[PDB]
Structure formats: structure tokens, C-alpha cells
Write a protein that binds this ligand. Structure first.
Ligand SMILES: *[C@H](O)[C@@H](C[C@@H]1CCNC1=O)NC(=O)[C@H](CC(C)C)NC(=O)OCc1cccc(F)c1
Ligand SMILES: *[C@H](O)[C@H](C[C@@H]1CCNC1=O)NC(=O)[C@H](CC(C)C)NC(=O)OCc1cccc(F)c1
Lengths: 306, 306
């Protein structure tokens, strides 16, 4: 038993990380087949680049302007292109460690594993959720750009994030692997801010289900509420609305515990209006919303990824 | 910026995990060079679990009774010895993916990454702290025994933990890689319980320093304290005593922030007395104690946000 925030094993991704290093700027790249993907802002910017023309900068560059290092090894770049905010560098060598992979775009509320890297060397791994305001609460320092987020599906790696920047509130923003930002952000060093965050209601409910399963029950009551009644409580406490689909995917957990989903929602008011009243749930004094319903099921069962 | 519980990249350990099976019982093993290490209770019959004489069980086994599988490959066992509660199986094949590694025994308060595995296949990775009562608060299901905890320090893998059992309160216990349990526990299904846990004070202070490095100061105060006065108050909140060694180890973090350790202790005293008053520190409404001073220095930058 037990419930822990748990990243996917990172070995399949560690073998794809490289250092991409142009001019004075160093960041990480993702080496798949004979292409290295990295954030486009690696391109030697103006000096002054109040507003960089990435299209025009890339035309001024040759192949060897880009130094790519794989472990201690130099990779020969033979072509370079851009797709949205990602720079695609062709290399002469296919990565022999390339896993089965697909590029996917993730929805807010869904989670993925982050492999933080520096100078092309993996440094750590942790789980993040795509917030409703399209930021993630991560841990990134200078040189971490190009770190990627992913999920593993048996043996298929679904890459879903590149890392790009940090917002003034200390949270983080990035793109999918096709170079499309999550959220209303741009890759310029200008005034940017995250919208007011909301709480992922369906994940909170899943986490409460995980709590009852592991023995925590003080917050339950015999009351219920209709879907409409709850949503007005959520809208006051800055929570995502709860849809009939959300209730549906929570079905399995309702069976395991014998609480109807709306019958759990009655608890959630209680937590929202009154609070936890000096108590804790799964070792937290807050309501946690970065465990998806599947994350909970992936945890009560043992799903491995050979 | 940002602060997260961050595991080490698990790739170096993923390549060492295998499946070991004796009769009807299956668990994970650690394959390094031509030896596979796994918990000795894999030999146990069902028939008895309370008082097995493992020496007697093992003498009755031959090499081919042990089935070792690395992915799709069966490994042939050519020798077997027992060291405390760990079984060492010699194999005819050295693991070619074997890293630089060391076996270490960690002290309470130390942290490590756990690679949860099932049927020899990695399932997830997460950070754990050796609690003062010699348990870890993990996530383990049936079949997870043989999963290991580790740290990586310059491509050297320090193995410090092998999982054996779950205690009645939902926490977990295991051994070092030499087979000696952490704590007064034994690998039989008898009446066992963890001692009362305490809070790892030096880790809490490290985490408070981490908060300051990341720009947060609301919890500081204008006071200082003597080491003894702090410990007399802390023990009243069920906190581990703080030793001069702990104060010395906090030196670097105190230098980076310009907060004296005893001034940070003054803050913690006030936090224990007051609570969070609806506030959070690094996104938690509780005082977190599973980040060591080293964990903080590894993750934060060396430039604080003054
Ligand atoms: C073995 O893989 C692992 C499984 C435990 C029990 C469930 N979650 C775990 O981490 N350890 C054991 O099965 C040990 C083996 C002993 C002989 C050392 N047995 C055990 O922990 O029994 C207690 C127990 C508690 C909860 C649930 C359960 F199935 C067993
Ligand atoms: C890439 O390596 C870097 C990662 C950032 C840096 C510090 N934490 C991160 O996540 N990205 C950038 O530096 C980014 C590049 C521009 C072209 C988009 N700019 C940026 O993040 O500026 C905001 C910032 C805030 C605090 C500290 C900092 F260095 C930068």
C-alpha cells in the first residue's frame, strides 16, 4: 500500500538527451533517429534582441554554427530547420538508442514525467500536471531548456513537452514537440504572466478516493449533492467545473469505495467551506490536484513498462 | 526556480533489474557483474512464514531451483550464498549494463530514490527519506520486494536499500545491500510495528532555507536562539534533536542566504508555535522534512533571490 507521486522510469529518455550549444548559449536537445529537437531560441540572438527574428537569424547560420554533443561525442549536423518554436537539426547519425515514440499534445489536468537536464546530462526526474492555466509547477534552473516531459505506454514513449521558460511567479511554460506552446506565451524575454490558476476538480476527487482506499475517512459524510449544486461551490473556490464525463471516468473508484461521486462531492464542499479542521489527508494539509484518476489506478495496481 | 521532490534518473538502475522465482514466489533482483542480489524470503515455502530457518531452506535448494530472467533471457545460476537477509545468486553472465556502483548504509534522515519494480520490470521512481524509526513511507504492492533505493553522485550508483516488507501502519522496511535490516525488524510474518516517528529537524531547516533561496521570507523573525533552547522546544513538538554537526552541515546554505542557522531555528520555533495561518511554504501547508541539506543544494541555484 501507500500513495506517492511517482514519475515514469526515465532510462528510455536518458539515452536521447544531448547538448545543443550555439554561440554563448547552451541547452539540451532530444536526439531521435537522425534529428535533434531543441528550443529555437538557442539561435545566436542579435546581441540586443529586444525582438528576435528567428526566421531571419536561422538563414544567417551554417550547419557548424550548432555544436551537438552526445555523451562525450560530437554529432555532425548536416541540415537545420524550424517548425514553430522548435529547431530541428539533422545529424549524420541515427541514434541507436531511439525508443518507440510518438509526439502527443496533452490536455490540461493530465500529467507527465519531466526529466530535468543540464549540459545534455540528465539531472533528475519528477511528475508534473498541465495546469488549467497551461503552466506546470516544476523545478528548472539556467541551462535546463530542452528538458522534456513524457509518458510511457508499455514501451512507447509519448513525448509531450519541451521546456522553454520561467514565468515571474516561479512556474514554467513550454511547448509540445511540434513547437506549439501550451498557454498564451511566447519565446521572448518580455513581460509575461500566468493567468489565475484554478484547481483540477476531477483530480482532487480522485485523490480523495485514493485517501479512503488507504484508510483516511474523517472527511466523508452521508450527504450528497447534485452536479449543478456542486459547480456553484467550485466556481466560488476557483475550481474547474465538474462535467458528466469527469463523473464517468471516476466510476471505477466510486465502486471500489462505495461512495457515489456526487456523494464524495458533498465532502468536497465541507473541505472547501470549512477546511480540514486540523486534520490531514494522505500526509497533506492541502487538497492535492495533480493525481489523475488513472494515476490513482496505476498506483493501486502495479503497471510496469518493459 | 521551483522546488520538487526529485529522483535521480533511473536508467542506470533499470538495466540491472531482473525477475527471480523460487517455486510459487516471484520477486525482483539486482544484477551487478555476475551476481544477482534479492531478498532471501523468496525461498520461503507457504507451508510456513512465521519462523522459517532460511539456512535450512537454502541447503535444500539446488542452483536450478532458482529461475532468473533478465527481460526475455533466462540467466543460469552457478552458485548461491546467503549474507544476512539477502540472497546472492552467482550467474554465468556478467551484466554488461553494470554501472560504477557502491553499497552504502545510510543514516536516518538521509534520502534516496526508489525504483519500484514488479516482475523485474521498472514501474516508477520516487524519492524517500530514511525515517528516524527506520521505516520509509513508500508505495509498494505485492511483488515489489527486491526493488532498491539508490543515489547517483557523478555516475556512481550508491545502492542503500532493498525492499522487504510492509508494516501494519502502511510504512515499509528493508535492508542495505549487505542484507542487514534498517531498524529492529525481521523478515517473518510475526507481530511487528514501527516505533513512534519523529520529525527530521535538520531537513526542515534545510527546506526553510530552500524557501528563502527561492524568494520567500514571510516566516522569518527578528530573534535568535541558543542551540539548547531550540532543542528543548523542538522536542515538545516531537522533533529530532539538532546537533552541532547538523548546524555545521547547514553552513553552506546559511552562507548563501546570510541567515545564521540559529536564526533559522528561531523561525522554526515560531512556525511550530503559530502554524501556517493559511499560508504555504514551497507549496506545502506543513513543514516538510524529507529534503536533506544536500538535496536542497543539488536542486536550488547558488544565487538566492534577494
Ligand atoms: C513483497 O513483495 C512485499 C509486499 C509487501 C506487502 C504488500 N506491500 C508490500 O510492500 N513484502 C512482503 O510481502 C513481506 C514479506 C515478508 C516475509 C518479509 N510480507 C509482509 O509485508 O506482510 C505484511 C503485509 C502487509 C500488508 C499487505 C500484505 F499483503 C502483507
Ligand atoms: C533555458 O535554459 C532557460 C530556462 C529558464 C531559466 C531559469 N529557469 C528556467 O526555466 N530559459 C530562459 O532563460 C528563457 C529564454 C527566453 C528566450 C524565452 N527566458 C526566461 O525564462 O526568462 C525568465 C527568467 C526568470 C528568472 C530567471 C531567469 F534566468 C529567467
Amino acid at each position: 500500500s501507500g500513495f506517492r507521486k511517482m514519475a515514469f522510469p526515465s532510462g528510455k529518455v536518458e539515452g536521447c538527451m544531448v547538448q545543443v550549444t550555439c554561440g554563448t548559449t547552451t541547452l539540451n536537445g532530444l536526439w531521435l533517429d537522425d534529428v535533434v529537437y531543441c528550443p529555437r531560441h538557442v539561435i545566436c540572438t542579435s546581441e540586443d534582441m529586444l525582438n528576435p527574428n528567428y526566421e531571419d537569424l536561422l538563414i544567417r547560420k551554417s550547419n557548424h554554427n550548432f555544436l551537438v554533443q552526445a555523451g562525450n561525442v560530437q554529432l555532425r549536423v548536416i541540415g537545420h530547420s524550424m517548425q514553430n518554436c522548435v529547431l530541428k537539426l539533422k545529424v549524420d547519425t541515427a541514434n541507436p538508442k531511439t525508443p518507440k515514440y510518438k509526439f502527443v499534445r496533452i490536455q490540461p489536468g493530465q500529467t507527465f514525467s519531466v526529466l530535468a537536464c543540464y549540459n545534455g546530462s540528465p539531472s533528475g526526474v519528477y511528475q508534473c500536471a498541465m495546469r488549467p492555466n497551461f503552466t506546470i509547477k516544476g523545478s528548472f534552473l539556467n541551462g535546463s531548456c530542452g528538458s522534456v516531459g513524457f509518458n510511457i505506454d508499455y514501451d512507447c514513449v509519448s513525448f509531450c513537452y519541451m521546456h522553454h521558460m520561467e514565468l515571474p511567479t516561479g512556474v514554467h511554460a513550454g511547448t509540445d514537440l511540434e513547437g506549439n506552446f501550451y498557454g498564451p506565451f511566447v519565446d521572448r524575454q518580455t513581460a509575461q504572466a500566468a493567468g489565475t490558476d484554478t484547481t483540477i476538480t476531477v483530480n482532487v476527487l480522485a485523490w480523495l478516493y485514493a485517501a479512503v482506499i488507504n484508510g483516511d475517512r474523517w472527511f466523508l459524510n452521508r450527504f450528497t449533492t447534485t452536479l449543478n449544486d456542486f459547480n456553484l461551490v467550485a466556481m466560488k473556490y476557483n475550481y474547474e467545473p465538474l462535467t458528466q464525463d469527469h463523473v464517468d471516468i471516476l466510476g471505477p473508484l466510486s465502486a471500489q469505495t462505495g461512495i457515489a461521486v456526487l456523494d464524495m462531492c458533498a465532502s468536497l464542499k465541507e473541505l472547501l467551506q470549512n477546511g480540514m479542521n486540523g486534520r490531514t489527508i494522505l500526509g497533506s494539509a492541502l487538497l492535492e490536484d495533480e493525481f489523475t484518476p488513472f494515476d490513482v489506478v496505476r498506483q493501486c495496481s502495479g503497471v510496469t513498462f518493459q
